[PDB]
Amino acid sequence: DIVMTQSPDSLAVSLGERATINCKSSQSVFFSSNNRTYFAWYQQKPGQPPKVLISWASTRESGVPDRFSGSGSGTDFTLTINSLQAEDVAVYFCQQYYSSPITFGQGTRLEIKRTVAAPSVFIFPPSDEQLKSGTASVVCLLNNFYPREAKVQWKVDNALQSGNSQESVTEQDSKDSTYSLSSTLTLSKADYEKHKVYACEVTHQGLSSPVTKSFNR
Amino acid sequence: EVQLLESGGGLVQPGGSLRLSCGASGFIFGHYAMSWVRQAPQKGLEWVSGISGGGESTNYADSVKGRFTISRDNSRNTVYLQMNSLRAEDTAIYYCAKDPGGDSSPAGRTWFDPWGQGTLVTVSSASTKGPSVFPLAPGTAALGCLVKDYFPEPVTVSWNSGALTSGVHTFPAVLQSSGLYSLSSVVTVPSSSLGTQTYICNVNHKPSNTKVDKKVEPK
Ligand SMILES: *[C@@H]1O[C@H](CO[C@@H]2O[C@@H](C)[C@@H](O)[C@@H](O)[C@@H]2O)[C@@H](O[C@@H]2O[C@H](CO)[C@@H](O)[C@H](O)[C@H]2NC(C)=O)[C@H](O)[C@H]1NC(C)=O
């Protein structure tokens, strides 16, 4: 099969700047007889299927804003996104349709850089319903922040926890370019009832000093 | 207004069989080739199968040849993917995609526009388990639902049967050490509404016929 290789695998670009995504094919997908390159670019936004941006290496598909442009021919191709917008956050795929089977690039992840935004922090105790099953989940929410890098530390009676928490981060928002993050501390009911103060400490570039949210019982 | 809507995904034991369907509307279906493209957890997009407008011509990826059969109904406006002898490596989101110009030869040697939302096919020896949902109790407050211990993916979470959509974050599922997934869906609301506006998360785990509504109240 024809192999499509994209470079880079991921990149972050500020709003209003230019993003460049490259794709190489293992053979020429240019046909000399009809002056056509059998190449296409797709955009896949979070939670959505791919949407075609560029056909024939360089033809912008209808409805695609003209700040997207595709260039190249033969084996080396480039997608250019000028004046980057928040909604451009996506994975961008290349595809050849020169010969069956059609093949796709592995994807390039586009991250939007924006101004720093501090997280809103919330802590949630385990429900009484969950406690009757023998497990306690304590949840810490970091809402609508940028950049993605953040430090969440669980403390139980001021003792630092490790190995009993998991994190999940949302895809970057297509409108305000922020992230949200959840940290879940999982304890046995017995261990949960052994202690009183459950605290979530968040360290983030948008916070001048770490923020703690806590509850008792 | 071209729309493609896939269905049929779920959990399949290895060697088992599954049929995916794709409903099309908004265009003369029989005039266009349709293809199935899948996207594996660690792999990229991989074309699976294509079929001409009238269905007389088909093409298949080598990895699925002989086990997958593509067909279409040009009256019901549906395209199908029949999968037999399924393997672990067939686990993917499966998409339905339309030939933009007509009937390209071989079937599928084209770009695609548009694509459907995808349906997840999980091939695994593990058994289905539905989620337990617990409330995350709360001038803007945050609340949510904890969707714990389910298999396989996915779960869908709506709020107030769709009446509440603004401010919703449903986090990606994280695989726990138990082999089960867990996620949270949270939403921020005005604090002045807490006592008077009811908040219910609608959790749907199709692999297990689990539909749970959980009321989330201040404690
Ligand atoms: C050959 O075609 C190019 C552009 O056509 C193709 O563009 C895509 C369909 C894809 O298949 C590419 O690989 C091809 O190169 C012609 O270049 C255009 O020329 C017009 C003026 O005639 C100009 O306004 C456009 O900007 C040009 N576009 C590009 C991308 O260069 C070129 O003239 C053709 N050469 C021939 C027929 O000899």
Written overview of the protein:
The complex is a heterodimer of chains A (217) and B (219). With 217 residues, chain A is mainly β. Chain A has 2 domains: 1-113, Immunoglobulin-like (Sandwich), CATH 2.60.40.10; 114-217, Sandwich (Immunoglobulin-like). Chain A contains 2 helices and 21 strands. In chain A, the strands form 5 sheets. In chain A, strands 2, 6, 7, 8, 11, 12 and 13 form a 7-stranded mixed sheet that branches. Chain A has a 4-stranded antiparallel sheet with strand order 1-3-10-9, with no helix packed on it. In chain A, strands 14-15-19-18 form a 4-stranded antiparallel sheet. Chain B has 219 residues and is mostly beta strands. Chain B folds into 2 domains: 1-125, no CATH class; 126-219, Immunoglobulins (Immunoglobulin-like, Sandwich). Helix content of chain B is 0%, strand content 47%. Chain B has strands at 3-7, 11-12, 18-25, 34-39, 45-51, 58-60, 68-73, 78-83, 92-98, 119-123, 132-136, 140-150, 156-159, 168-170, 174-175, 181-190, 200-205, 210-215. Chain B has a 6-stranded mixed sheet with strand order 2-10-9-4-5-6, with no helix packed on it. In chain B, strands 11, 12, 14, 15 and 16 form a 5-stranded antiparallel sheet that branches. The termini of chain B are far apart. Bound molecules: a molecule of 3 linked components (NAG-NAG-FUC). The site of a molecule of 3 linked components (NAG-NAG-FUC) has 9 residues of chain A, from strand 5. It is classed as immune system. Keywords: Malaria, Circumsporozoite protein, Fab.
